[PDB]
Structure formats: C-alpha cells, structure tokens
Amino acid sequence: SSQIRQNYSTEVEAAVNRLVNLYLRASYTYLSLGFYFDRDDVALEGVCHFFRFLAFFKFFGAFRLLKMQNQRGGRALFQDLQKPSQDEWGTTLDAMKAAIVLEKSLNQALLDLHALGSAQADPHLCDFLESHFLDEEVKLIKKMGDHLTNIQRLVGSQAGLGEYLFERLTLKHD
Amino acid sequence: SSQIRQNYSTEVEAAVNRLVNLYLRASYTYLSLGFYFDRDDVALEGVCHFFRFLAFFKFFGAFRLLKMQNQRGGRALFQDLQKPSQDEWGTTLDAMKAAIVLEKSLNQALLDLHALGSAQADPHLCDFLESHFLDEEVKLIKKMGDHLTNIQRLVGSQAGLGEYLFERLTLKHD
Amino acid sequence: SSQIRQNYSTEVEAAVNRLVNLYLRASYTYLSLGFYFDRDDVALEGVCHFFRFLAFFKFFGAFRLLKMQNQRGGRALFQDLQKPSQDEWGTTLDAMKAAIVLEKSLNQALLDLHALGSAQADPHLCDFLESHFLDEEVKLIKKMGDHLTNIQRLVGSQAGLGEYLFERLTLKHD
Amino acid sequence: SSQIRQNYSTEVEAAVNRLVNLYLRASYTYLSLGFYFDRDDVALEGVCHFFRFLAFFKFFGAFRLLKMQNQRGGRALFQDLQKPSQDEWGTTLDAMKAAIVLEKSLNQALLDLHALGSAQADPHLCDFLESHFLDEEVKLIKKMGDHLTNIQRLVGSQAGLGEYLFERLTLKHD
Amino acid sequence: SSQIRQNYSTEVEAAVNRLVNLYLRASYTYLSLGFYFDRDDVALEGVCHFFRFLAFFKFFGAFRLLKMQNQRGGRALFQDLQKPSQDEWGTTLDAMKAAIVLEKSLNQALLDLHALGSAQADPHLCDFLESHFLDEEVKLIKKMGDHLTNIQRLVGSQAGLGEYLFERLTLKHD
Amino acid sequence: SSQIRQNYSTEVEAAVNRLVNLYLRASYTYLSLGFYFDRDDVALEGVCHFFRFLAFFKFFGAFRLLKMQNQRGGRALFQDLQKPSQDEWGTTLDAMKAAIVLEKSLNQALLDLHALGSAQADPHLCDFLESHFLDEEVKLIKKMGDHLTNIQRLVGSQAGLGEYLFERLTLKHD
Numbered sequence A, B, C, D, E, F: 001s002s003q004i005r006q007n008y009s010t011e012v013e014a015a016v017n018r019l020v021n022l023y024l025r026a027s028y029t030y031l032s033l034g035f036y037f038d039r040d041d042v043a044l045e046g047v048c049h050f051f052r053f054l055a056f057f058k059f060f061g062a063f064r065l066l067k068m069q070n071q072r073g074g075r076a077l078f079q080d081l082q083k084p085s086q087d088e089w090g091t092t093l094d095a096m097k098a099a100i101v102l103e104k105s106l107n108q109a110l111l112d113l114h115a116l117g118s119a120q121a122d123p124h125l126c127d128f129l130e131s132h133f134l135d136e137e138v139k140l141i142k143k144m145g146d147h148l149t150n151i152q153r154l155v156g157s158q159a160g161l162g163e164y165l166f167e168r169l170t171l172k173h174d
C-alpha cells in the first residue's frame, strides 16, 4: 500500500481522476473554440484569444488536481478524452452561451466533489477546492455573464456590427 | 559566358525576370490604391497606410529576386511596367477584394516558379522561394481574408458607418 | 468555398488533422509519464521534468499544425483522444524506450505527410514541416538515444543506484 | 466637383501626373543601373550603391508630387511606365553620363512646370517646386558633374585602374 | 543496428562521409593558400587573411556534416586527406581562379548529394543542405566572382601595382 | 634565395614541415575521437568535448609552426595526411591510452627537433620550442596521466558505472 496516504478515500481518489478528465475535456473544447474564431471566415481575434486563454487555464486546473492526487498518495489514471460537442461554434453569442454551460458543469462537479470530501471528513480536499477552484470558477462565470449581457445588448438589428464592436472594444486583442 | 553561373537554367532566369515584372506591377497597383484612399473625398487613412505598406513590401520582393538573379549569375532584364487595372478603387471592400485577387496571382506565379525549379533540379531556387516568399504570401493572404470577413460583417445596412469603423478600429493609423 | 485556400489539397488537410490527433495523443502520453515519475513511490524528479517538458513541446507542435491549417484555409477538426498505452511506466529505461518508440512514430507520420505534400506539389507544406518539425524531431530522437545509452551503461548489477545517478547527474532538476 | 480644390488648374494637374511618370521612369532607370553594377562581371559596389540610392530618391520625388496632387484636390492618374533606355550600361563613365542626361531632363521638366504654374498664377505650386525640387536637382547635377570630371581625369591609359580607384576612393561602399 | 536511425540510407551515409573528405581537402587547400600569401616574398596580408578565413569556414562545413551524420545515426568514417594541388599558388589572380574552381567542385558535390537525398525521399537531408550549405556556397562564389572581375580590371600593364591596390583597398587587413 | 633567411638550416626547415604533418595528423585523430564519443551509442559528452578541444589545440600547434616557418624564411610544404589509426575507439580508458601514446610521440618529435636545432646552433628554433611547445606538452601528458589513474580506479567490477561517473564528475560538460 501507500507509504504517505492518510485520510484519502478511494471515492475521492476516483472522483479526482474523473474531474481531471472533465477539465481536460473543457480544455480541448476551448482549444477548438479558439481555432474556430481564428478561421479566415470568422476572424474575431479577441474571441480567439479569450478561448485560447481558457484552454490553458482549464489545463492548469487539471494539472493542479493531478499534482494533488500524487501529494495525497492516490494514483492518477487517465481515460480517453472525448472530442468537443461541436465542430463549428456559430456566433460569439453562441460560443459564450456554450462556454457558460460548460463552466456551470465544471462548477457542479467541483461542488459535488466538495460534498464528497465533506462527507468523508477530508478537510485537506475541501480546502484545496475552496482555495484553488471554487472562487476562480465563480469569478469566471460572472465574467462570462457580463460578456453575455454585453453581447445581447449589441445584437439589436445589426448583428454583424455588434459582434465586431464587442470583439474590438471589450475583448483583449493586438 | 558567366564565371559564377552553375545549375541555373535559362528557363529559371527568364521566369525570375518575369516575376520581377509581376511584383513591380503589384507594387505600382498598391501605390495607386494608397493614393486613392488618401484623396480628400475618400479619406480612409488606415486603408491608405495598409496599401502604402504593401507597395513597399512588394517592391522589396522584386528587389530580393533581382539580388538573387545576380547571385546566381543570371542577367536582370527589365520590361515595361503596365499601369494598374483601375484608376479608382471603390470601397474598402472593393479594394481588399482586388488585393486578394492580386495576391493569389502572385502566389500562383511563385508556385509555378517553384515547380519549374523542382523540374530543373534547382534546389537553391526552390529553397529561396520557400524561405523568403511562400510563407510571407500565405500569411498575407490569410490577413486579407480576415480583413474581408470583418469588412463584410460591417456592411449591414449602414455601409458608411461600417467602413469608418473598420478603418478606425482594425487598421493602423495616427 | 474558401476565399484564401490555394494549392491546399483535401488529402493534406485531412492528414494534418490526423497529425494533430497524433501529437495531442503524444502530449497526453508525456503528461502521464511525468505524473508517474512524480509519484512518492517512484520519485525521480529529473525524469518527471523531462517528460513534463515533452508534454508541453508536443502540445506546441499540435498548436503550430492547427495554426497552419487555418493559414492555408483548411478546417481544423478534432477527434476523440485515446488514453496513453500504459497506466504505469516501469523504470526510467522502460519509459525512455517507450518515448523513443513514440517519437519514431511521430517522425514517420511527419515523413509520410511530407511525401504527400511533395506528391501534391505543395511546397508551403513541405517547407513548413522541414522548418518547424523534421530537425526538431531528429534532435529529440538523438537526445533520447544518448539517454538510453547512458541509462543502459548504468544498469550494471545495481539498477537502483544507476537509476538514481542518471536522474541526479544527467537530468535537469531542482 | 472637389470640395477642397482652389486655384489649381487642370493644366497643372495633368502636368503633375506626367511629372510623376517621369520620376518613376527615372527611379526605374536607376534601379537597372544599380543592378548592372552589382553583376559579378561588373562588380563596382560603390557605383551600385550610388545608383540604388538615386532610385530611392527619385521614387521619393514621385511620392511627394502624388501627395501634393491630393493636397490640392487633383486626381493622381498613373500611366504605363516604360523600361529604361538600356539593358547594359557600359563603364562608370558611360553610366554617369547617362545619369546627368536623365537629371537634366527631369530639371527641364521641373522648370517647365514652374513656368506653367507661374503663368497660371499658382504660387503654392511654384513654392512647392522651389522648396522641395529645384535646389535638390541643382545639387545633384553639380555632384554628378564633379564625379564626371574625376572619372575623366582617371581614364588616362589605364581605364580599369582608374575605374577601380574612383569606386574605392570617391564612392561610398562597405 | 542503430536505435535512432530512421529514413537514413546507406547511400546518403557514405556520400556524407565523402563530402566531409572533400570539405577537409578544401580546408587544407585554403590553409596552404593562406601561408603562401604570408611568405616574405609574396607578402599580401589581405589575401593571406581571405584564404585563412576560408580554411576555417570549410572546416566548419565538415564539422556540421559530421554532427549531422551522428544526429541521423550514421557512422563518421575518415579517410586519408590528400595534399593540395599546388605548393606555390602564383598571383592573387591565379589563386582566386583556383579558389572558384574549388568552390564550384564543392557546390556540385552539394547538388549531387541533394539529388541523392531527393531520390531517397530524405527531406531532413535536403533541408539540411538547403539551410546550411547551398546559399552559403552561392554567396561565396558570387563574392569570388566579384573579386576576379576587380583583379582582372587592375592588371592593365602594371600587374604589381594592381595586385597591391586590390589587396590594400578591397581585402580586409590590419 | 631568401632575403630574410639567416641561420636557418635546410634540415630544420624540413623537420618543421614533417612536424606540421604530425600535428595535423594528431588534430585529425582527435577530431575522430571527438565524433566517436558523440555517437548516440557511446554518448559521453565530456569525453567528446575533451577530444574536440585537443583537435583544436593540435591544429593551433601546426599553425604556430607554419607561422614560424615563414618568419624564418623557410617554405611551408604540405603532404598528404593519413587517416587516424582506428575508426572506433573503444572505452574512455582505451581512448585516453591512445591519446597518451599519441602525445608521447609528438613530445619525442619535439625533443628530436630541439636536439637538431641545438646541433645546428639555431637558438631561435630552440627557444621557440621551449617557449610554446615543450611545457604545454608536459602539462598535457600529466593531465592525461591523472585522468588514466582516475579512470583505472573507477573500473572496479562495474565498468559502465565508473565510465559514466568519470565523464560526469571529472570531464567538463553542459
């Protein structure tokens, strides 16, 4: 058995491995979103950069979980990674709606793992999620919600104009 | 005969001279585009500067070809340079469409010369085009395509508004 | 159809998408290798850092391919990503042998794509692979081969001693 | 009609467009002169650099005229550009004689345009030529004349020696 | 067999070893040229330094080939090195003519190896020659041709005078 | 005859030319040793760098002799250079033993030339060897002897371990 493992349930160990798969799935979804908005026939650089950054950020979340798994003496186990849900992502509005759906799913997975940890009396797990994941997720979802509202107010009856303006004047670009 | 020339066909030498004429023609087209957008009755500074820069960039391509001609021991031969295809260039959209047509023609000329070089077993010629021309051309055409998509999304039903916004918020100006 | 695409076959476009999948598979394999050597019951930091860096490097290769796909006017298409071939990776020797097998497979995929590009008279594709992939791969495989030889000479009859010494004195660590 | 144009005759507008053609012709002549002296079988670097600089300087003159055309509310119109008068330019002496002939022709065109402007009571045109063209031209022709005299004194009965010495000791080179 | 070797023919491996011998032969020829022009009864320092630098440059070419041989998993094999073709090298003109003959022979060997690589579908080999050898060779041969033309124009009927002047005013010396 | 030569025998002149051949032979031997230890199946970087440096150092010795030949008014004469004695160099121990054999042969050649110079009452020759060659050779042979002793003490019954340790902990590497 493990020489370091202490107060670390098999249930938590397995749930952490599943959460890693979810975050890597999310990372891959954002990679696809980024390259869609980089297409010459889409060409919204600020949108591309927004999702490319999220791809890296979700990968970092997976990395932290994996590090924690080893710190606790669990065994990182990797599974197949499903492709993203779409090949083409429509408008900025469509994409930001898909992103907030994705983030809510990751948030619920975080809350579910926190509840498991609490049931298992695993305070290191609970604190780890609180300190590195829960607030970052709330902050990101608030940001997406802010963006959705601004995108929606810009649709009006000149959708193209508003999509350009949002990309130019809210999102970070060269 | 030439004291330095080696593995340099007459076919390649002649094709290089024709390519120089094509690039100088392109340079002159961009000079005309630039001065059109500088007119007081057109007055799109970012568009003017975009095409003025391309005039210089295409001249630089011609210059590099001429330098290479001499490095290989061929003889630079200059022909008459035809004037651009238009005197007035319409909207930014019209102009960017003409530019991408022009660039595709230069790209095809590059690919044709590369194929001639390959047929003639002239690896210095092939590498020269690969290293200094092919990727620069792909990059430029991608940029133009990005611009066309952004211009097209801004037309809407307020063409003037969108043409101003594109010039202000995408193209580089004072 | 595409407004920028020129001299870019459907065969190459599809092969690039498959190559992206191969590089992301390789990246994921290296992520798993890295976290195995980070285990408290394996604990070879220099080996962990070697494979973690390769995970990032292979991801970067996939990223460059995807960027190129868009520059040429092809469509990035993502498929499911299979999990790595093993859950536990044995000794440093075992792992470095698996790594060189993996790299040879990526190298053969590169050479196959280069041959397709050459058959299709696609010099931009050929140059792209030459300039950004082929030499990096040769260099990496040479490095792995150097490492294998040093690992093999250290096995002797005190395998543990040699595995520690290699990690301490050849691989980069804190 | 034009919203800015004032005191700008059609005669001057047309003459400015013709002068642009003359300066671009001169620029192209100097480009050809430069590349001739860059040939491996000519190989006079200081002579190459002298004419390359003049190619740029004459292009700059054309550019200033075009800018002025727009500032006055005239319409820049570009015509075909004839190739230079020669494909091969003989000795430095031959080339410098051709250059001074060329410059005298540009100078006479300047003086003719100034006279037209004066007849048309167009003081902005007259001042523009005085301030940016007439003295630069006098200065250049004086310099060429200085060079011709030095070249002629070096011919003697060892033409090759003198042509080398002039290039080395008067003209600017690496 | 080799643990790293992939897509590297025996034909290419052998041809690389022969090319190393050719470059080391060339290096030795330049060493001899340099020391001839350092003789008190020849005493042309700029000529000495020109050929001494080429001795080092050709050695560097051999070194790069040898490094590449190992990177590909071939076996560097060294053969006897023949002495240079002459013990005394005549005038600067004689020497520069011998040098351009030598360089054309190295260039043809490069082109022959590139053709072998292409026949063998060895793109790493082809790119290696393109990126590190072909253009450097074209550049050097152009430089030599420039020098030959300047030497030839200085012969006149005062050969000694012209040989001194060329060494003083074109070649780099203290 | 020579305008500078004084007190410089034909015997010394010829012996200097032979010594140059010996040092260039030694340089080539070290080049081969270096590239052997750079092989992926040998892979001892510190050993590679040790012999690569000696290749350069022996070349420098040959260069100094050639310079001296000219300073004295003798004629540098180059002969064919035989290939090294081996294609593969065995262990570090084997290689260092071959190196000390080589160095002892160069040292004896130095001492023989010094004795010839002394017999010929050629104090400039004697001082030249004393000041630039004899002590450098003694120092190098002492260093090699130190290395041999350390290599021999590390063989024990785990030859691979000791060869790695010597390369890592005594020889200079990245």
Ligand SMILES: [Cl-]
Pocket (backbone or CB within 6 Å): A082, A083, C080
């Ligand atoms: Cl799926």
Ligand SMILES: [Cl-]
Pocket (backbone or CB within 6 Å): B082, B083, D080
């Ligand atoms: Cl026309």
Ligand SMILES: [Cl-]
Pocket (backbone or CB within 6 Å): A080, C082, C083
């Ligand atoms: Cl699988």
Ligand SMILES: [Cl-]
Pocket (backbone or CB within 6 Å): B080, D082, D083
């Ligand atoms: Cl004409």
Ligand SMILES: [Cl-]
Pocket (backbone or CB within 6 Å): E082, E083, F080
């Ligand atoms: Cl021989």
Ligand SMILES: [Cl-]
Pocket (backbone or CB within 6 Å): E080, F082, F083
């Ligand atoms: Cl032998």
